[PDB]
Amino acid sequence: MKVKSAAKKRFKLTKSGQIKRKHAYTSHLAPHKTTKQKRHLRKQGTVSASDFKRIGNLI
Template sequence: MPKVKTKSGAKKRFSLTGTGKIKRKHAYKSHILTKKTTKQKRNLTHTGLVSSADMDRVKLMLQI
């Protein structure tokens, strides 16, 4: 049986922390930034964690 490949889109978007949680970046920070406030753009800069509801789906994509 062949090896199961990791989804290449997921491997670019997610990374693992030392404790096994999955880090993600916030959406809405790539374009049309002129109409967004400075505070909004600043808060979107920080990384977040994948929610527990989506954890199983992301782990399947990453083949963890």
């Protein structure tokens, strides 16, 4: 098979896995969440170990 367009457009891979992704719930409704929440979800990260398994066998 071939890789998925949505996946490659939303998954960033680097040395030894550790998929990079951003956090949603930030780009639409500013007044609906506090600035603390906004900057706390502004950064980047990697999904949990269970989802790490769910994505590792998927790509």
